[PDB]
Amino acid sequence: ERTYLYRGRILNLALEGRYEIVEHKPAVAVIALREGRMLFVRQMRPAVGLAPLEIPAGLIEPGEDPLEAARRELAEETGLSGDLTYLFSYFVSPGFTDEKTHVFLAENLKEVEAEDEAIEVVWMRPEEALERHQRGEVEFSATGLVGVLYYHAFLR
Amino acid sequence: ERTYLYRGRILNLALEGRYEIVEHKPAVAVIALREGRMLFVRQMRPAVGLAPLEIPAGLIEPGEDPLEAARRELAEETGLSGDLTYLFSYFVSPGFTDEKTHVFLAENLKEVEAEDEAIEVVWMRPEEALERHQRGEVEFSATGLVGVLYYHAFLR
Numbered sequence: 651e652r653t654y655l656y657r658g659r660i661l662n663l664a665l666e667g668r669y670e671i672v673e674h675k676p677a678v679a680v681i682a683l684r685e686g687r688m689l690f691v692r693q694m695r696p697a698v699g700l701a702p703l704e705i706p707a708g709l710i711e712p713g714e715d716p717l718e719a720a721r722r723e724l725a726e727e728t729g730l731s732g733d734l735t736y737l738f739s740y741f742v743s744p745g746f747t748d749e750k751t752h753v754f755l756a757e758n759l760k761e762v763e764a765e766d767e768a769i770e771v772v773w774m775r776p777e778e779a780l781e782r783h784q785r786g787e788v789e790f791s792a793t794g795l796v797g798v799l800y801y802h803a804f805l806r
Numbered sequence: 807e808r809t810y811l812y813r814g815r816i817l818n819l820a821l822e823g824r825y826e827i828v829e830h831k832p833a834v835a836v837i838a839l840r841e842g843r844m845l846f847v848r849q850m851r852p853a854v855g856l857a858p859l860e861i862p863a864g865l866i867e868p869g870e871d872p873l874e875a876a877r878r879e880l881a882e883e884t885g886l887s888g889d890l891t892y893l894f895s896y897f898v899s900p901g902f903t904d905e906k907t908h909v910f911l912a913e914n915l916k917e918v919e920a921e922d923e924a925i926e927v928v929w930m931r932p933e934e935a936l937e938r939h940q941r942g943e944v945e946f947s948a949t950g951l952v953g954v955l956y957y958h959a960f961l962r
């Protein structure tokens with residue numbers, strides 16, 4: 651038996667025996683390179699009180715599958731569309747939440763819209779994002795770090 | 807004002823205006839290679855109902871800093887010690903939680919203990935972990951995927 655303590659907008663909090671469990675919608679994230687720059691985004695994140703370096707990401711909404719959600723959040727956050735390829739998925743923190751992230755690569759990006767304004771588009775070479783992070787200048791989300799590592803592994 | 811709905815063992819659930827926020831202890835994770843195999847672990851994770859491929863990881867306990875927590879969970883989960891180097895950190899899912907993970911590299915591993923039994927030690931070439939994941943055979947945690955990508959980027 652899961653017993654629910656809180657049913658919310660973007661999460662539920664449940665107890666399952668001794669375990670505290672946060673149910674959360676699945677997410678998508680998109681890795682995109684153009685002229686050696688990766689497409690990052692930043693927004694104020696009240697949970698952490700700062701704006702980490704992320705890649706375009708969002709929740710999968712009712713009716714959508716991961717590919718469709720990835721297309722949508724790329725367009726809504728950055729005004730771009732591209733050719734999407736599924737890469738891999740991961741559980742963000744499976745010791746307490748079921749949130750799963752599906753990661754895509756985008757190629758051949760084109761502007762379809764001139765976007766959500768509280769999101770800052772940050773094109774940045776991934777080598778520079780990693781250096782800024784090593785020097786303490788920026789924090790990463792998991793999606794931002796996965797983008798930077800994937801680039802270094804496979805896109806040079 | 808954060809208003810608290812739940813104060814627990816491994817998380818607190820808070821509201822901050824419209825935002826649902828899960829406070830969570832920071833974590834560590836350790837990337838370790840030996841003879842071309844990466845040190846993964848698996849354990850049943852009730853939040854997800856399965857055992858994803860992770861790397862050795864744990865929460866930072868009172869009094870500890872990340873390096874010390876990394877040493878401890880490597881020994882407790884796998885019976886090993888090594889020379890630790892800090893790599894980078896990431897917020898697991900900063901749209902709802904403040905959990906931050908500090909990732910270390912371990913080299914020169916030695917057995918100090920013959921360990922916590924509900925953790926399965928899984929030495930596996932990272933190329934094979936990535937293939938098994940691409941074929942649907944295993945799920946990744948963020949820490950497992952970060953280990954595999956870091957290897958491919960920097961440890962070949």
Ligand SMILES: Nc1ncnc2c1ncn2[C@@H]1O[C@H](COP(=O)(O)OP(=O)(O)OC[C@H]2O[C@H](O)[C@H](O)[C@@H]2O)[C@@H](O)[C@H]1O
Nearest residue numbers: 668669670671742743744745746815816833863864865947
């Ligand atoms: N959902 C939970 N509810 C209550 N207690 C729990 C839960 N999960 C574990 N404990 C207790 O908490 C104690 C300390 O857990 P440690 O073993 O240092 O950590 P880790 O490997 O779980 O988590 C490490 C990271 O890996 C994953 O990505 C996680 O999501 C974290 O981000 C354990 O003894 C359990 O008794």
Ligand SMILES: Nc1ncnc2c1ncn2[C@@H]1O[C@H](COP(=O)(O)OP(=O)(O)OC[C@H]2O[C@H](O)[C@H](O)[C@@H]2O)[C@@H](O)[C@H]1O
Nearest residue numbers: 659660677707708709791824825826827898899900901902
């Ligand atoms: N803590 C919250 N509480 C309540 N509502 C919120 C919260 N955060 C956002 N919303 C509402 O939820 C709506 C849908 O959010 P989308 O914009 O598709 O997602 P994302 O970028 O937030 O999260 C994407 C991933 O990136 C990060 O790693 C996250 O942790 C996720 O893993 C937003 O309109 C907000 O109005």
Ligand SMILES: [Mn+2]
Nearest residue numbers: 706707708723
């Ligand atoms: Mn978003």
Ligand SMILES: [Mn+2]
Nearest residue numbers: 862863864879
């Ligand atoms: Mn652990």
